[PDB]
Design a protein around this ligand. Structure first.
Ligand SMILES: *Cc1cc2c(nc3c(=O)[nH]c(=O)nc-3n2C[C@H](O)[C@H](O)[C@H](O)COP(=O)(O)OP(=O)(O)OC[C@H]2O[C@@H](n3cnc4c(N)ncnc43)[C@H](O)[C@@H]2O)c(*)c1C
Ligand SMILES: *Cc1cc2c(nc3c(=O)[nH]c(=O)nc-3n2C[C@H](O)[C@H](O)[C@H](O)COP(=O)(O)OP(=O)(O)OC[C@H]2O[C@@H](n3cnc4c(N)ncnc43)[C@H](O)[C@@H]2O)c(*)c1C
Ligand SMILES: CC1=C[C@H](O)[C@H]2O[C@]1(C)O[C@H]([C@H](C)/C=C(C)/C=C/C(O)=C1\C(=O)CNC1=O)[C@H]2C
Ligand SMILES: CC1=C[C@H](O)[C@H]2O[C@]1(C)O[C@H]([C@H](C)/C=C(C)/C=C/C(O)=C1\C(=O)CNC1=O)[C@H]2C
Ligand SMILES: [Cl-]
Ligand SMILES: [Cl-]
Ligand SMILES: [Cl-]
Ligand SMILES: [Cl-]
Ligand SMILES: [Cl-]
Ligand SMILES: [Mg+2]
Ligand SMILES: [Mg+2]
Ligand SMILES: [Mg+2]
Ligand SMILES: [Mg+2]
Lengths: 500, 500
């Protein structure tokens, strides 16, 4: 509620709060403000704009790029005190403050009301960045994107005069700020203003005003499988057969009407140095033939592969399953990572598979931790028209995430080069990047990668903005001109109006 | 604050909420109430008391025993809505609600005020059970037990007539409820009443009433080391030298005035099947000669061992370090675990060491996941007289935690036997248990183990109650007679009045 002292170099908290969770980026802000309300954010924004000081907001700190911690940022607004999660009877919707972590969101919504939101897997990700970016995760095939439930958004914006004010923008089409609401359904963090809180509830018409009916219900229990194929004895033809099995399966079973909307999985194509390839799968356990359906899927992936996978399955209550590291991730954010990603509308072709194999088995590189992970997608995501939100990829079947991780900062160039070359080579037919509307559908802004705007790495002539946003981009630039005319909110991949 | 519907079988949340985080114990409650106030706790209690229904409280769900999920328990009070952490200005103390997790506690106190509490490592542990039981963790050597900061407690109690009421008990010796407060400094959960919230504050008399000065400050940054010895290059002689070096060092360097109170480590004596023996160490990074002080410790542990360990050190800001899985644990609460523990006043003698070796190297057992962990302890913990709190062990150098983990419920007897026989054999000279006042100082009630009350496994003639509480037990019994005369709050290891 009340304002408190900001954090400056010298403070015991400075080394923590000058960073997000991505340790590659160490900020030099002069002041970090632990804001407590919309009114305080307005005060912080006005003084900063009067004095010419560059601002950035930190919510959960999960940014894969240096949007918040880059050296030009002088004033951070840290949303840590604004972490409430609750049901706002005033609006008939669930309020999620920007500083709320996904783990607090899922615990509170489910323990208290028996509902959930289909966002990310990672418990520590913050609502602030995640929802704005088009968050998704294990329940997306079943329930769509988290932005599919965005009813309203409270956001502190800066007018042309440099005054800051707070506005509510709603899903109501007659709402005078409806455009700014739209831009929060995937327009991405750091662009338009400071989100204070989001309100979430089903669009559905025919619903009693009871919180327990206003958001999706998760499956009560799920089956959770780990499958591991050892690399020693996995030849190129074995690798390729497993990839192509998996792609075909997702090609045929990711429609919005598929009975497989209740499955989610991540196939990890690891460096052969790791000694094993792995897959994690989750299926709704509450229907009749659940055990069998899981086995059918696993059988499809390993069909004719010629390597016997070690397989184990456990069954867990839903909220418990969310924190199993097989789905949540291993919680270690203390290394250095570089992430790239793409939408896939169809699975890898024979050429891309060959590149994958070469690159993952290569002895030119030394790092067991590089991975290309194929994340189950589509399903109910794809029920939504591509222009209804600012998430324009509504017919994809997988997200593909290329990652490499290491320790020593002296080694940055070597790991960064490995991953740029792998990604370029996989997307070689199309300028080194996943051009929208073909085999791929561009890229996902919650996995930002500044190389998509680098002309050395992107040779497709398709700019970064179209990779992320497709035809959403002109409408996001209209919102930008309207609500952030001074371009107060910006970073290496921020929405920007046309040249004057 | 409003009451909401209780959770009953058939509810989507029942499979999650009938459990804690220990999956070995599955409750059969008839109703789980998500209480939101003292007032609502009173109603729920006094209606159970009128019906004769057995109650239990759930906060963090981390109980290592079946105290909450025992099949006799009929009505659970789940504290999840009572999760606030903040500074209570009127009382001049930090208020932590019983449902708050230790990660929310550390994030709030540190980011907002730059202070902390020396409680547990694990971020998902609940305040409710942890503080009551005598919580400690990586900063205990520096700052004592979390109970050394308990200033007041708000607890709902049941009187002889069966009426529920809420009382506030403080650290002021003339408080009529002072002994109730005292029982909450280590008495253990599930014994006296329902804790709504704790109030925490330094005992120092100097201190100006400002929140940033009323709890201890953590070190701004720490060094964190992971040292690993491969099992394949370890003979019994090497093993024993290692354990002896470690024990001697802890013997010499754990007094309340030691320069080494800023060091914490965990030595993991793992089954040799695991391929590696490991030690995680944390040291304050901020004072002169930090790196070299760390080095002289790691060198002391390895001295004359004849096996060079893999040793890497990272430096991290303090709040970030709390979430590194090396200190925090790996977050996986699925599967099945049995935990035993002991206080250590001196390190293992030669015969105990040979026992450890035999049992960790045995091929009569098949489990890589068995470990004996030696956790740094003492330091400022040991500046408090043994009788000032219900934590009676105030001269120990180490906690020793014995663990085995597995998957299949049909193997329960085998793993339970293994860990039972290990612990008995280590404590063979004292009836198979760590009898207080000698080489050991009993056991720690936050690591409960019902076997300590089992004549088949405890043949020492020292009862369970004396192992946990030493000469604190009579004062704890008086508190039980005075505040829980009906014995509403009970479990397999609950404080019990003398037979009449
Ligand atoms: C590290 C990490 C990221 C994950 C993980 N799992 C995900 C998943 O299963 N599904 C996903 O869709 N995404 C996953 N992600 C990625 C996260 O979704 C993105 O990393 C989010 O953008 C992160 O959000 P947040 O934690 O809030 O990150 P910040 O660095 O604070 O902000 C990112 C970006 O957004 C701007 N921004 C923050 N807060 C605000 C507010 N209130 N208003 C406007 N703009 C805001 C920031 O300035 C920054 O530009 C799993 C893991 C382990
Ligand atoms: C699983 C787990 C436990 C840990 C971990 N790390 C620890 C550490 O680093 N240091 C420690 O000292 N302890 C560690 N522990 C153990 C925890 O301290 C104990 O397991 C705590 O007892 C757990 O507390 P909580 O999470 O609240 O567990 P519950 O199961 O809800 O309760 C335990 C016990 O206490 C009673 N009780 C709960 N809440 C109340 C209230 N409000 N009032 C009275 N009594 C209460 C319960 O009924 C039950 O009897 C690391 C990990 C991973
Ligand atoms: C399923 C997930 C969805 C989320 O979108 C993110 O979360 C999950 C669990 O996995 C995704 C991906 C496969 C794994 C990554 C990036 C690994 C990251 C990693 O090891 C590290 C870091 O990021 C920093 N230090 C590190 O060591 C990632 C994009
Ligand atoms: C330093 C710690 C202090 C805490 O007091 C607890 O945390 C820390 C990190 O370590 C302690 C101990 C070594 C480890 C244990 C019990 C492992 C548990 C474990 O693997 C499992 C479970 O408990 C359930 N499933 C599982 O797989 C434990 C008691
Ligand atoms: Cl949808
Ligand atoms: Cl209350
Ligand atoms: Cl935890
Ligand atoms: Cl947990
Ligand atoms: Cl008893
Ligand atoms: Mg958990
Ligand atoms: Mg990693
Ligand atoms: Mg974290
Ligand atoms: Mg484990």
């Amino acid at each position: 509620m009340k304002h408190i002292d900001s954090v400056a170099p010298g403070d015991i908290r400075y080394e923590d709060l000058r960073r997000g969770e991505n340790l590659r980026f160490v900020g030099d802000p002069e002041e970090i403000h632990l804001v407590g309300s919309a009114a305080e954010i307005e005060q912080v924004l006005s003084r900063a704009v009067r004095s010419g000081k560059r601002v950035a907001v930190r919510s959960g700190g999960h940014c894969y790029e240096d949007f918040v911690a880059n050296s030009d940022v002088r004033v951070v607004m840290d949303m840590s005190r604004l972490s409430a999660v609750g049901f706002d009877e005033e609006r008939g919707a669930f309020a999620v403050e920007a500083g709320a972590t996904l783990g607090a969101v899922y615990k509170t919504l489910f323990r208290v009301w028996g509902v959930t939101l289909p966002g990310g897997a990672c418990p520590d990700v913050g609502a602030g960045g995640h929802i704005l970016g088009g968050g998704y995760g294990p329940l997306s095939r079943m329930h769509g994107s988290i932005v599919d439930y965005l009813h309203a958004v409270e956001v502190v914006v800066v007018d042309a005069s440099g005054d800051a004010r707070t506005v509510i923008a709603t899903r109501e089409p007659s709402d005078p700020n409806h455009d700014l609401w739209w831009a929060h359904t995937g327009g991405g963090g750091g662009n338009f203003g400071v989100v204070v809180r989001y309100w979430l509830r089903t669009a559905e018409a025919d619903v009693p005003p009871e919180p327990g009916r206003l958001l999706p219900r998760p499956p009560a229990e799920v089956l959770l499988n780990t499958t591991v194929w050892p690399w020693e004895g996995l030849d190129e033809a074995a690798f390729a057969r497993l990839v192509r099995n998996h792609g075909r399966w997702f090609e045929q079973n990711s429609g919005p009407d598929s009975p497989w909307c209740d499955l989610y999985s991540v196939l990890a194509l690891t460096r052969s140095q790791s000694g094993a390839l792995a897959m994690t799968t989750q299926l709704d356990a509450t229907g009749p033939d659940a055990e069998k359906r899981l086995e059918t899927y696993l059988a499809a992936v390993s069909e004719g592969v010629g390597v016997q996978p070690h397989s184990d399955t456990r069954r867990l209550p839903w909220l418990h399953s969310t924190r199993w590291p097989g789905i949540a991730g291993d919680g270690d954010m203390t290394g250095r990572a570089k992430i790239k990603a793409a939408y896939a509308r169809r699975s890898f072709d024979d050429r891309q598979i060959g590149t994958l194999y070469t690159r993952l088995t290569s002895t030119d590189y030394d790092n067991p931790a590089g991975v290309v992970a194929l994340i189950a997608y589509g399903g109910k995501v794809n029920a939504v028209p591509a222009d209804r939100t600012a998430v324009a990829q509504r017919d994809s079947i997988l997200k593909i995430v290329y990652v490499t991780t290491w320790e020593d900062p002296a080694q940055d160039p070597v790991h960064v080069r490995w991953i740029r070359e792998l990604y370029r080579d996989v997307y070689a037919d199309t300028g080194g990047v996943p051009v929208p509307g073909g085999a791929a559908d561009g890229a996902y802004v919650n996995y930002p990668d500044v190389d998509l705007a680098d002309e050395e790495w992107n040779t497709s002539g398709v700019p970064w903005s179209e990779l992320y946003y497709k035809d959403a981009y002109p409408r996001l630039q209209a919102v930008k001109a309207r609500w952030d005319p001074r371009n107060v909110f910006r970073h290496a991949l921020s929405v920007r109006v046309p040249p004057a």
